[PDB]
C-alpha cells in the first residue's frame, strides 16, 4: 500500500543521447545545444591510474565525438571540460528540453534515476544519497551517464550523473556541474567510501507513514530526551537527530498525533529489542530512503 | 543492489488524459482517436450500488463526456461500451500514440504502473499480478483509469487499468478489453479478495539472487521430486510449480550451479522450519514479486 515511487521519467527520457569516443560509448544528457557526459568517455584503458584529462582532451577535436540522439547523429561544434564532465556543443537544440535546473543534493535526500544503456532508457527507480556520499543503486554495464533527478512541478531538477561502481558495489557520481559527491575521483583505482550510517530523519518519517497507514504496533507510552535518544543512536550507527530535524517532522507529528520525541522513544525500543518478526509497512527492516517530503506526497 | 525497477514511463505519459462525467473525474488512455476509461465514470454515488450500465449509457450523449488532454480539450465524436471499459471516439488522433499491444497479464508476472490523478502523471512503480487476481498497489482517490504496462523494444504492452479498491486494501481492474482480472465486478458489493497464495516461481528466483549475492546458509543436500515439493508448498499456501517454471529457472540454475529441484529442497526446509533467526538478502520474509527475469538482469 505504501511503496517507493519514482517520478515519471518522460521529461528526462527525451534528453538521453549516446556519446561515443573511439571505442567507448556511454550516455549523455542533451539540454538546449549542449550534451553533458562523463569525461572518462575519452579514456580507453588508461583509466587506471594514469589519466591526465587535460592531456587527453587537448588531443581531441569535435570530430572525435560521435553523438547519436536516437537515429539522428548530432554534429559536435565544440567541446570543453567542467570538473569531471565533458560539455559538447551541438548544432541542434533539443526540442524536448524541459524546464530544468542543476542542483546539488545533500546527504539523506532522495531522487529518481533513469538507468540507460547506450542512449536508450531501460528502467527507473527511486534512491537516496547515502550519508557517505555513495548511492546504493542499480548500474549495469553501459550505465555511465545516466542521471538522477527530482521533478516539481513541471521543472526537472537534475542532481546526479553516474560515473563508476566502487569495490563494495555501491555507486559514485557527480552533480551536473561535474563535481563528485564524496571523496572519489574518476580513475580506475581502488577507492573506499567512509563508513556509512542510517538516515535517522528518514526512519522517523517512515515510522509516521506506518502510523498514517494504520500500523501502530511499535508505538508505546514512553518518551525520551533529544540527547537521551541520540545516545542510543550512536550505539546503533544512526546519525544524530538535530533540533531542526525535529522541526521538519513537525507537520507529520501533528497529523499523526505523536510528538516527535515520542516517536523517538518508539524507535529507541525498536532498535533495542528488534522487531521480533513483525513488519512495519510490509518491511522487516527500518527503511531509511523515504524523506519526510516523500511521506507527505503519499 | 537488487531493486524493483519500473519501465521508463514517457511513452504512456503522452497517452494519459482526464475524463469527466458530471461530478466524478478519472483518467483515460488516449491511443489514436479513441479514449479508454472505466465505465463507472458514468455512475453516480447512488447508481453505484446496482447500476445497469446499458441503461445509464443510452441516457448519455457525446456532449456529456468532457475529455481534457492537458490544456487542450478533445471533442467526443462517439461512444461505445466494451465490457467494463468505455471507448470514446475523439475529435483528434493522439500524436504521441506509440507502438502498442493489449495483453492479458498472467498471475505472477510483473508490470509497471503509472499512477495518475486528474490526467496528470504522479509516479511510476512496479508490481505483480497476484494469484488471487488482485494487485498490492498504491492508488489514492483519483487514480481510477491509471494503467499498468510493460515495454518490449519500442512497443508498449498495456495490460492493466485500475478500477477499484477492495476492502482488504488491494486493488482490482481490467485488461484493456475491459475484462476484469479475478471474479470482481464494477459495483459496490460485498466482494473481497480470495485467499492469496505466494508466487513460488519468484521466491525461488529470489533465493537464486541471494546465492548470487553471497547468502547461502539455506542450501542443503536433501533432494525432492517436483511432486513432493508441490505437495508441501500447497500446504503452506505456496503456488505449486509447473513444468514451465522449472524451465524458466534454467539460466539461474546453471549460473549458480544449484539444480532447480535442489533449490526446491532448500525452500521446502524454510517452509517447514522457518528462518528464525536468520535473514535472507537482509529480510526475514521471502520476497515474491521479483521475477527470474528481474534477477537475470544483474
Report the relative pairing of strands A155-165 and A99-102 from DSSP bridges.
parallel
Residue pair A39/A53 in contact by the 8 Å Cβ criterion? yes
Element (DSSP H or E) covering residue B114: strand B110-117
All three cell numbers of B278? 536468520
State the catalytic residues of A.
40, 144
Q: What is the CATH number of the domain that holds A266?
A: 1.10.1840.10
DSSP label of B211 = H
Segment A40-49 long-range contacts (CB within 8 Å, at least 24 positions apart):
A40/A84, A40/A144, A40/A163, A40/A186, A41/A86, A41/A144, A41/A145, A42/A86, A47/A186, A47/A187, A47/A188, A48/A187, A48/A188, A48/A189, A49/A187, A49/A188, A49/A189
Vertex A281: Cα angle to A195 and B187 (nearest 5):
150
DSSP string, B23-36: TEEEEEEEETTEEE
Q: Which residues contact B237 (CB under 8 A, 6 or more apart)?
A: B195, B196, B197, B198
Inter-chain CB proximity A10 and B14 less than 8 Å: yes
Please choose, from the candidates B152, A10, B149, A4, the residue with its C-alpha nearest in 3D space to the C-alpha of residue B162. B149
CA distance A225 to chain B (A): 31
Q: Which of A2, A10, A110 to mutate to test the interface with B (most CBs of B within 10 A)?
A: A10
Give how far the C-alpha of residue B201 lies from the chain's centroid of Cα atoms, to the nearest Å.
17
Please choose, from the candidates B15, B6, B8, B9, the residue with its C-alpha nearest in 3D space to the C-alpha of residue B98. B15
Give how far the C-alpha of residue B193 lies from the chain's centroid of Cα atoms, to the nearest Å.
15
Residues B156 and A59: their CA atoms lie apart, in Å, by 44
Chain A residues lying within 8 Å of B122, measured CB to CB: 5, 8
| C-alpha gyration radius of chain A | 22
Looking at the partner chain, which of A1, A8, A125 has a beta carbon nearest the beta carbon of B5?
A125
Residue pair A288/A281 in contact by the 8 Å Cβ criterion? no
All three cell numbers of A13? 527520457
CA distance A277 to chain B (A): 7
Inter-chain CB proximity A298 and B5 less than 8 Å: no
Q: Tally Cβ neighbours within 10 Å of residue B222.
A: 10
Element (DSSP H or E) covering residue B235: helix B226-235
Inter-chain CB proximity B8 and A9 less than 8 Å: yes
Residues B49 and B220: their CA atoms lie apart, in Å, by 55
Can you tell me which residue has the cell 494519459?
Answer: B16
Looking at the partner chain, which of A5, A123, A139 has a beta carbon nearest the beta carbon of B123?
A5
Q: For chain A, which residues lie within 8 Å of any Cβ of chain B, measuring from their own Cβ?
A: 1-11, 13-14, 114-115, 121-125, 127, 136-140, 169-170, 277, 279, 283-285, 298
Q: Three-state SS for B50? A: coil
Can you tell me which residue has the cell 537534475?
Answer: A158
Name the residue range of residue A18's domain.
10-90
- Resolution of the structure in the document, Å: 2.0
How was this structure determined? It was done by: X-ray
Residues B253 and A291: their CA atoms lie apart, in Å, by 38
> Phi-psi bin for B214: left (phi > 0), alpha (psi -120 to 50), beta?
left
Looking at the partner chain, which of A124, A136, A140 has a beta carbon nearest the beta carbon of B9?
A124
Q: What is the CATH number of the domain that holds A15?
A: 2.40.10.10
> Phi-psi bin for B119: left (phi > 0), alpha (psi -120 to 50), beta?
left
Please choose, from the candidates B149, B150, B151, B126, the residue with its C-alpha nearest in 3D space to the C-alpha of residue B138. B126
Please choose, from the candidates A131, A94, A83, the residue with its C-alpha nearest in 3D space to the C-alpha of residue A17. A94
Q: Tally Cβ neighbours within 10 Å of residue A177.
A: 13
Residues A18 and A27: their CA atoms lie apart, in Å, by 5
Residues A291 and A109: their CA atoms lie apart, in Å, by 7
All three cell numbers of B247? 524451465
For A44, A152, B58, B114, B126, the CA distances from A146, given in Å and listed in that order, are 19, 20, 51, 21, 20
Amino acid at each position: 500500500g505504501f511503496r517507493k515511487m519514482a517520478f515519471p521519467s518522460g521529461k528526462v527520457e527525451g534528453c538521453m543521447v549516446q556519446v561515443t569516443c573511439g571505442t567507448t560509448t556511454l550516455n549523455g544528457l542533451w539540454l538546449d545545444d549542449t550534451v553533458y557526459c562523463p569525461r572518462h568517455v575519452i579514456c580507453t584503458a588508461e583509466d587506471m591510474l594514469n589519466p591526465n584529462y587535460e592531456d587527453l582532451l587537448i588531443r581531441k577535436s569535435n570530430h572525435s565525438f560521435l553523438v547519436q540522439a536516437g537515429n539522428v547523429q548530432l554534429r559536435v561544434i565544440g567541446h570543453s571540460m567542467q570538473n569531471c564532465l565533458l560539455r559538447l556543443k551541438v548544432d541542434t537544440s533539443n526540442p524536448k528540453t524541459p524546464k530544468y535546473k542543476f542542483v546539488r543534493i545533500q546527504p539523506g535526500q532522495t531522487f529518481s534515476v533513469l538507468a540507460c544503456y547506450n542512449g536508450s532508457p531501460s528502467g527507473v527507480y527511486q534512491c537516496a544519497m547515502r550519508p557517505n556520499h555513495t548511492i546504493k543503486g542499480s548500474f549495469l554495464n553501459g550505465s555511465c551517464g545516466s542521471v538522477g533527478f527530482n521533478i516539481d512541478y513541471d521543472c526537472v531538477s537534475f542532481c546526479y550523473m553516474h560515473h563508476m561502481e566502487l569495490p563494495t558495489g555501491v555507486h559514485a557520481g557527480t552533480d551536473l556541474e561535474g563535481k563528485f559527491y564524496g571523496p572519489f575521483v574518476d580513475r580506475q583505482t581502488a577507492q573506499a567510501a567512509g563508513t556509512d550510517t542510517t538516515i535517522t530523519l528518514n526512519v522517523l518519517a517512515w515510522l509516521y507513514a506506518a502510523v498514517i497507514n494504520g500500523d501502530r504496533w511499535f508505538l508505546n507510552r514512553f518518551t525520551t530526551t533529544l540527547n537521551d535518544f541520540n545516545l542510543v543512536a550512536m550505539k546503533y550507527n544512526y546519525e544524530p537527530l538535530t533540533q531542526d530535524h525535529v522541526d521538519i517532522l513537525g507537520p507529520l507529528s501533528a497529523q499523526t498525533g505523536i510528538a516527535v520525541l515520542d516517536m523517538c522513544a518508539a524507535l529507541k525500543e525498536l532498535l533495542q529489542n528488534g522487531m521480533n518478526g513483525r513488519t512495519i509497512l510490509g518491511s522487516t527492516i527500518l527503511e531509511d530512503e523515504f524523506t519526510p517530503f516523500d511521506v507527505v506526497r503519499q
